[PDB]
Symmetry: C4
Subunit: 246 residues, 4 copies
């Protein structure tokens, strides 16, 4: 039957979760985190609005190749860190591993910059996203992850309903970032729980997959929905489900 | 005379003053304030100037929702500290207390964003406004509040007169910020006094009621007036009278 | 003959200098300065680029009254320090002195802002300008001042010449800030020499007045010249003239 | 015959390299560097991206002369450091030397600002370029220079190819900065080798002349090329041969 269309996307879910664990391991090799305080999520969001405010003021100060530059900087660094925990844990601190990541990251970013085959893009998106998922997963525990997840899920539902209101009223009464970004979102808990086949939060993984099933059903009808809340709600569901076992 | 129209505003005056005294109470529970020096107003002038400068560059980074984002943030934090101290007085440091604040705050801001009954707003404004009123009122003593108040009174009469003259000459010779904001102002002295039935600065409360009496009379006639000076001039009046008594 | 018109500039020269010495006095009551280092002039120029970049990004982030607001702050600070040293020297350490200053500065700025008679302006300009003049005069010694004056006389002469050429080429081959400001300029050497009727660098004052004799001679003619260099040149002249006595 | 045209560029290569070396010797006299670590390139890249971001936020904040200002700043400081170290070696810290630098730098930037003869500019450009060349060159050793240079050549090739494609697709399918800057590029490695007639990495210099040979050939044919890669590739070539030598 109809498999391939728009179903490699949850495949990217399972994947990013996976790659986030397999990256959980090599990642403690360089410190990271940041304390399982619940103020930690707030630090997150403060710095996130900061990050966005920054990205936007780059754009409005763009930037003929300079935008493409700055984001190249950010890239090459981030890839250097991926391959960093990867190789530099694997082959260890050796000269070989360090060249391995340097050359590794130069290679990759230069590829993605040179017009790939752009299903490639789905993969590097998977890599990176898993990366981020796993670090903020190693930064602190569920209880905060839970607060953050409920938090963002309600923000999404709020703004979605809001612009929707702007749509109904307007009569008479590149997106990939937000994508893989909110793909990471509820899998920070799939990591920060295993970081707390595997754990009982295989349940969180599948509960999250079901959250996506729900979403991808709601949206594939005319007039869309929130987005996060089915995902965070569902991942929190499947996870707190992974609690009856242990 | 006439009641409910534009007398719910002084309703909001006595209110926010009241709520600001009742908030005098729980607030020392997390410290706050701030030194009874008069050097506070000019640094204050500094920091409000910074804050407005900030709010504005937020706007210029709009930001279809990023505006609403950052300001929603600032708002919700402030609500969480409201319900926070609320909790740390009632149940005190308990886990339950902190959650009480979460749910409280979520309730409040998520409500306020989802288009309520918007007599709600005058109220939420009363809440927040009472928040700031009560803090800076708990922040240090009368005399500084007094000077700061004279200072601001002169800035308003200045700018208002400035632009008014600018209208008469030009022939040939969102507002709730400044609003509930100016509703807050003379309640700090009402607070910073009970902080210094209650204080003899119940008189400042009634004096504030006389300031609004004057303002809401004159402004309610064609061709407006200064604004602040009737309010602070009058509240400081009633206050220093309530100093002349006891 | 024609004396009084457009000869008030050297008059305010003599004036701003005089008031600058009378202001040399009260100022140590609150410190200021900043070591006679030859690196300090650059601290100055950097921080002026700071002040201007600030001033410009304020303007283009303007600013309904917010411009007039912010410059109201900066102004009022400056006035409170003027009357601060004035009174706190005059009335001495007393509380009374401090009030002398608030009452003073509020009075003054409220005035200048409420459409005075704006011959006021030349005087407040004399005050303020003299103030800044003496503060930085108290910041460090001659030798650095000498170099600094040469430098600014050159920025003036270069940019003047540059845009002049841009005028000869362009055919076929608020100013009050730079005013009272560059009026302050050559009098910082008249102060920091008074620290190295009175001193023998009265000569720098009249010699500088003669630099202006040159200047105000040229201005009233078609096709200008530099500006600073006749003044700083003339003041350094009068100063190294004032070297033979002491 | 065709001498002076587009063959003065390799002469300026040899020159900037030479002046970078003859200045290499005296330069360790005030510290410099920044540890032959490879984290140096990545932080660096950060700092150039930052510096440009800053320079730009100047530019759109022009600033009729404020632009010209800040860049005048950078200029005269840097010339004062050139003639600065120049003097602090010879007569040493004495007044004669430091005055020599000031006056020197005065001469130079004041000249270079007043519309020169602009073969002058190739010369002062050679000066400055040799300066920066020798500093980051004395800043630490090769292997980092190796990594950094590989990085820069690849980014250059990336953006050139990118916008080239961007040119072929739009059918139907002030410049001296990047100049003397990447003229410096392969001469830091020519320097970080004397900091490591002369060395056997005199070869890197002719390898660089071969890189420029290649480049001034390709580009001087209709439809240009990358730029860095011939230069860095070739200088690294001649250099690594001078490693096979010893």
């Amino acid at each position: 039957r109809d498999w391939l269309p728009l179903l490699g996307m949850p495949l990217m879910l399972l994947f990013v979760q996976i790659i986030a664990i397999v990256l959980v391991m090599p990642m403690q090799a360089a410190g990271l985190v940041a304390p399982s305080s619940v103020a930690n999520p707030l630090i997150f969001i403060g710095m996130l609005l900061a990050f966005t405010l920054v990205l936007l003021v780059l754009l409005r100060t763009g930037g003929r190749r300079f935008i493409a530059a700055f984001i190249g900087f950010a890239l090459f660094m981030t890839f250097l860190y991926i391959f960093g925990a990867l190789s530099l844990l694997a082959l260890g601190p050796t000269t070989a591993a360090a060249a391995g990541t340097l050359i590794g990251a130069v290679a990759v970013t230069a590829l993605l910059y040179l017009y790939p085959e752009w299903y490639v893009i789905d993969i590097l998106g998977v890599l990176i996203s898993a990366g981020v998922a796993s670090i903020f997963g190693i930064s602190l525990e569920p209880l905060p992850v839970l607060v953050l997840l409920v938090l963002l899920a309600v923000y999404d539902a709020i703004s979605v309903y809001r612009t929707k209101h702007m749509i109904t009223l307007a009569e008479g009464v590149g997106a990939f970032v937000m994508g893989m970004g909110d793909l990471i979102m509820p899998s920070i808990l799939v990591v920060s729980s295993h970081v707390f086949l595997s754990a009982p939060t295989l349940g969180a993984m599948v509960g999250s997959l079901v959250g996506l099933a729900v979403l991808l059903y709601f949206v594939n009808k005319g007039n869309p929905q929130a987005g996060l809340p089915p995902l965070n709600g569902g991942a929190i569901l499947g996870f707190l489900v992974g609690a009856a076992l242990a």
